Amino acid sequence: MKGILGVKVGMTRIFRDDRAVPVTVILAGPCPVVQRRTPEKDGYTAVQLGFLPQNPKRVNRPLKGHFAKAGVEPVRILREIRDFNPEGDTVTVEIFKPGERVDVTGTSKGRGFAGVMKRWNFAGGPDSHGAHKIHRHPGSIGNRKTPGRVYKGKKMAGHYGAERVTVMNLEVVDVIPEENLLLVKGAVPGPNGGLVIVRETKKA
Amino acid sequence: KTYVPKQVEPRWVLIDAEGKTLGRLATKIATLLRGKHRPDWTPNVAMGDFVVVVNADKIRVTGKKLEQKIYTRYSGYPGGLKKIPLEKMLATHPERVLEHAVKGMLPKGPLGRRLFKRLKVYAGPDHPHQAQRPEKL
Amino acid sequence: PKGVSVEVAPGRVKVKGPKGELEVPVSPEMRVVVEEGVVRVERPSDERRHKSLHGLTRTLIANAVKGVSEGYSKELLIKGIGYRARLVGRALELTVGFSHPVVVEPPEGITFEVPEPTRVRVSGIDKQKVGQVAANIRAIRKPSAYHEKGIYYAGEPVR
RNA sequence: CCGAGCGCGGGAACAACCGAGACCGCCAGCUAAGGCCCCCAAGUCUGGGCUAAGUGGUAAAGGAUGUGGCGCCGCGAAGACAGCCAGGCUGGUCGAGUGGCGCCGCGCCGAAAAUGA
RNA sequence: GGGGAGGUUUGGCACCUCGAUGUCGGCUCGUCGCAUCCUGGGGCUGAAGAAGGUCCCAAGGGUUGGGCUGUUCGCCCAUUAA
RNA sequence: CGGAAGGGAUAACCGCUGAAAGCAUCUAAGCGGGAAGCCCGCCCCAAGAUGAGGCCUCCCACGGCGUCAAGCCGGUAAGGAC
Numbered sequence: 166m167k168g169i170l171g172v173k174v175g176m177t178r179i180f181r182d183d184r185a186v187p188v189t190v191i192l193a194g195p196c197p198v199v200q201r202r203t204p205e206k207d208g209y210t211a212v213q214l215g216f217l218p219q220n221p222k223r224v225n226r227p228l229k230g231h232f233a234k235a236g237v238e239p240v241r242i243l244r245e246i247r248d249f250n251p252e253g254d255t256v257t258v259e260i261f262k263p264g265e266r267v268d269v270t271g272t273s274k275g276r277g278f279a280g281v282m283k284r285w286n287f288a289g290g291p292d293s294h295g296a297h298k299i300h301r302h303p304g305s306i307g308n309r310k311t312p313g314r315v316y317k318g319k320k321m322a323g324h325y326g327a328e329r330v331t332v333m334n335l336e337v338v339d340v341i342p343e344e345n346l347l348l349v350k351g352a353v354p355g356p357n358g359g360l361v362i363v364r365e366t367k368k369a
Numbered sequence: 370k371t372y373v374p375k376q377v378e379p380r381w382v383l384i385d386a387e388g389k390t391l392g393r394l395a396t397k398i399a400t401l402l403r404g405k406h407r408p409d410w411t412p413n414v415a416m417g418d419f420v421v422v423v424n425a426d427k428i429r430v431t432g433k434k435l436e437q438k439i440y441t442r443y444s445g446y447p448g449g450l451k452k453i454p455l456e457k458m459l460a461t462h463p464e465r466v467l468e469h470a471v472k473g474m475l476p477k478g479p480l481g482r483r484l485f486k487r488l489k490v491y492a493g494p495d496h497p498h499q500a501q502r503p504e505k506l
Numbered sequence: 507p508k509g510v511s512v513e514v515a516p517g518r519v520k521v522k523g524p525k526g527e528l529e530v531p532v533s534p535e536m537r538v539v540v541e542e543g544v545v546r547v548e549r550p551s552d553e554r555r556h557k558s559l560h561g562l563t564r565t566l567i568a569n570a571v572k573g574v575s576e577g578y579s580k581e582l583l584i585k586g587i588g589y590r591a592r593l594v595g596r597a598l599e600l601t602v603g604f605s606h607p608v609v610v611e612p613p614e615g616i617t618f619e620v621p622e623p624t625r626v627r628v629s630g631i632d633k634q635k636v637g638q639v640a641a642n643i644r645a646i647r648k649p650s651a652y653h654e655k656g657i658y659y660a661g662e663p664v665r
Numbered sequence: 666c667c668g669a670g671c672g673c674g675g676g677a678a679c680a681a682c683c684g685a686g687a688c689c690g691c692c693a694g695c696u697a698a699g700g701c702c703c704c705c706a707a708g709u710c711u712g713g714g715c716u717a718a719g720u721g722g723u724a725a726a727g728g729a730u731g732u733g734g735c736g737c738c739g740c741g742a743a744g745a746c747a748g749c750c751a752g753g754c755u756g757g758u759c760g761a762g763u764g765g766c767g768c769c770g771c772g773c774c775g776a777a778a779a780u781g782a
Numbered sequence: 783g784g785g786g787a788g789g790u791u792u793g794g795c796a797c798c799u800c801g802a803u804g805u806c807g808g809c810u811c812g813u814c815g816c817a818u819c820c821u822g823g824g825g826c827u828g829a830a831g832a833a834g835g836u837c838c839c840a841a842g843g844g845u846u847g848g849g850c851u852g853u854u855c856g857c858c859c860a861u862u863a864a
Numbered sequence: 865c866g867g868a869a870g871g872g873a874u875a876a877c878c879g880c881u882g883a884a885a886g887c888a889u890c891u892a893a894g895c896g897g898g899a900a901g902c903c904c905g906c907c908c909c910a911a912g913a914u915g916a917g918g919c920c921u922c923c924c925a926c927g928g929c930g931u932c933a934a935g936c937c938g939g940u941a942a943g944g945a946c
């Protein structure tokens with residue numbers, strides 16, 4: 166179960182063999198293993214990968230010991246990757262061969278308190294014949310004396326976006342080890358700068 | 370004036386479960402769960418013995434029950450009526466089947482829940498080897 | 507029950523013979539007597555369900571015998587043109603009107619034989635096994651009720 | 666009977682169903698209907714049958730080798746029912762019952778509705 | 783000719799509500815039932831094949847756009863797996 | 865880019881062995897096959913799961929009243945807030 170952290174760097178299109186292809190560019194810098202957790206020590210298998218370098222002063226925390234426990238330059242972030250015990254001490258873009266399809270998790274863009282039309286792509290109301298009061302409203306929300314309440318999970322306006330979103334089966338295109346770059350099939354959650362993880366898909 | 374009890378040390382107990390009919394067992398477990406067996410009984414205070422059970426999966430049950438018996442878990446959401454047959458319970462967490470039987474026979478109040486804590490259940494056996502363990506049948 | 511080696515146990519009976527040994531789950535409330543070189547069995551009473559349990563084991567044991575004795579096997583005819591079957595080591599692949607050649611796995615204890623493209627015997631040590639496997643094949647292409655095709659046991663034609 | 670006893674007990678809850686007609690007090694006793702496995706007071710009480718449907722936990726015409734119990738009619742050790750051999754009921758083989766009707770007890774089907782059981 | 787289920791129709795009764803429980807359509811938002819329109823599974827066929835008939839199992843999801851009318855409904859155009 | 869694949873258990877239904885009832889029967893003991901449905905698998909939330917879970921790492925005695933016991937006042941550590 167391959168895995169690797171990275172940051173969305175941007176996206177433009179390249180030309181495959183003779184057709185254009187929109188691709189996103191991720192950057193999965195060398196991720197140092199920080200702790201392998203076995204079923205013995207914990208209860209599952211996984212690996213803690215660090216990421217960006219850090220001012221040793223900013224990491225005055227007890228994290229200093231956690232870093233020392235594995236003897237690694239203080240990273241900025243670190244997340245686990247389930248069922249995946251590698252080799253060596255660092256994973257790289259080398260893990261991914263062009264053609265392999267990956268799942269990319271990320272944090273969608275933050276839209277804050279968004280309207281129902283915005284959030285659930287509702288219909289709203291008529292712009293003309295009707296009252297100029299419900300142009301973008303949800304309209305009805307229930308029945309009468311029965312049930313006489315509102316179903317839990319009713320779609321309504323509210324804080325939306327800015328959450329964990331995973332897009333799947335993105336085919337890995339040309340991957341440049343020379344610079345730790347990694348091209349993908351374009352659509353990938355988050356803003357240009359967001360930490361994203363890249364895993365192995367489930368086609369079979 | 371009737372006797373006014375005072376602080377009493379928790380009497381633990383070890384109970385088997387092999388071959389024991391689900392309910393017939395749960396009854397006694399419940400009755401021992403509250404201090405309702407000891408003659409120094411007081412509903413107010415709640416001082417039932419810490420019952421600990423083992424070999425849950427072993428529990429017997431008469432007739433079409435593994436297949437018939439259905440358990441209801443209602444979530445707040447629509448159609449969340451999710452229902453599970455007895456066989457599935459023993460597959461997943463089997464300890465549940467005895468718990469959801471004892472829990473049902475304990476009183477409804479706040480101390481009734483405080484009693485459900487006194488009840489410990491596993492299938493192995495091998496309880497957390499504490500101290501007390503007075504076996505029983 | 508000649509030449510056999512039936513050995514009684516609590517809730518089961520281990521029968522041995524030339525073909526081998528095979529377990530046979532025996533009812534609880536039944537007496538598996540081993541009179542002489544042969545075997546008997548008797549029921550605790552004379553109730554409706556007990557009668558059923560007697561006759562069931564009465565035969566079910568006799569199968570454990572014959573099973574390790576002469577063994578079991580069922581034939582399989584194959585009608586229709588392209589319809590045929592080539593044995594391939596243990597397993598047998600048979601094209602029978604499908605774009606994909608049917609590869610049939612050989613379960614343990616069973617070893618079907620192919621004397622001819624049309625005929626196919628199924629060697630086995632267990633009536634339960636043999637019976638299923640036989641059907642498992644007829645299942646691959648039941649007898650077309652509008653003419654002769656697909657596999658047949660050895661019974662009448664569907665016409 | 667409620668009304669006027671929405672005062673008490675039971676019946677899950679509930680004017681009029683079952684018990685009962687509340688002058689006040691009691692950390693006394695016998696009961697009533699209804700109950701005595703746990704929530705819930707008192708029998709996991711005794712003895713004799715029935716029921717494998719959770720029936721019980723509450724639906725009909727009508728249907729069925731469900732299960733148990735009772736009575737009658739036809740064949741049968743002069744070999745019957747069933748299967749296997751032969752001929753088109755008869756023979757042989759085996760060898761102890763077999764086939765049809767009626768009644769009673771409990772039970773199966775018939776049995777699909779909307780927020781969670 | 784006979785037994786029933788449902789509580790969508792028309793209705794019977796007058797039980798809460800007349801010191802107020804806003805009525806038909808539409809829109810918006812749905813959600814539930816299954817007695818299933820489609821898709822999945824299956825039995826019988828007067829089932830050759832393809833197509834179809836009737837019955838059984840099964841809500842997961844799906845279930846178009848327009849002309850006419852205030853319409854619900856219905857008719858009609860063009861399509862659909864429906 | 866998604867609906868899956870896949871594993872498991874089932875519905876109607878198909879079947880193996882098989883008495884009760886010498887035969888016969890999918891069933892009464894037993895076993896196999898079988899759905900867009902059920903369980904799981906994917907994706908999101910999630911230890912107020914008060915039944916408050918696990919791991920890794922950092923800081924660590926008392927300085928004064930209550931005679932056991934539960935506490936109170938201040939300077940601090942790791943670390944946190946403004």
Ligand SMILES: [Mg+2]
Pocket residue numbers: 241242243
């Ligand atoms: Mg960190």
Ligand SMILES: [Mg+2]
Pocket residue numbers: 247
């Ligand atoms: Mg994770």
Ligand SMILES: [Mg+2]
Pocket residue numbers: 288289290291292
């Ligand atoms: Mg609009």
Ligand SMILES: [Mg+2]
Pocket residue numbers: 296
């Ligand atoms: Mg207006």
Ligand SMILES: [Mg+2]
Pocket residue numbers: 296298
């Ligand atoms: Mg206005």
Ligand SMILES: [Mg+2]
Pocket residue numbers: 311312313314
């Ligand atoms: Mg309500």
Ligand SMILES: [Mg+2]
Pocket residue numbers: 357
């Ligand atoms: Mg930018």
Ligand SMILES: [Mg+2]
Pocket residue numbers: 387
């Ligand atoms: Mg044991």
Ligand SMILES: [Mg+2]
Pocket residue numbers: 448450
């Ligand atoms: Mg529902």
Ligand SMILES: [Mg+2]
Pocket residue numbers: 448
């Ligand atoms: Mg639904």
Ligand SMILES: [Mg+2]
Pocket residue numbers: 421489496497498499
């Ligand atoms: Mg313990």
Ligand SMILES: [Mg+2]
Pocket residue numbers: 498499500501502
């Ligand atoms: Mg001990």
Ligand SMILES: [Mg+2]
Pocket residue numbers: none
């Ligand atoms: Mg046959």
Ligand SMILES: [Mg+2]
Pocket residue numbers: none
């Ligand atoms: Mg009067």
Ligand SMILES: [Mg+2]
Pocket residue numbers: none
């Ligand atoms: Mg009066």
Ligand SMILES: [Mg+2]
Pocket residue numbers: none
């Ligand atoms: Mg009252």
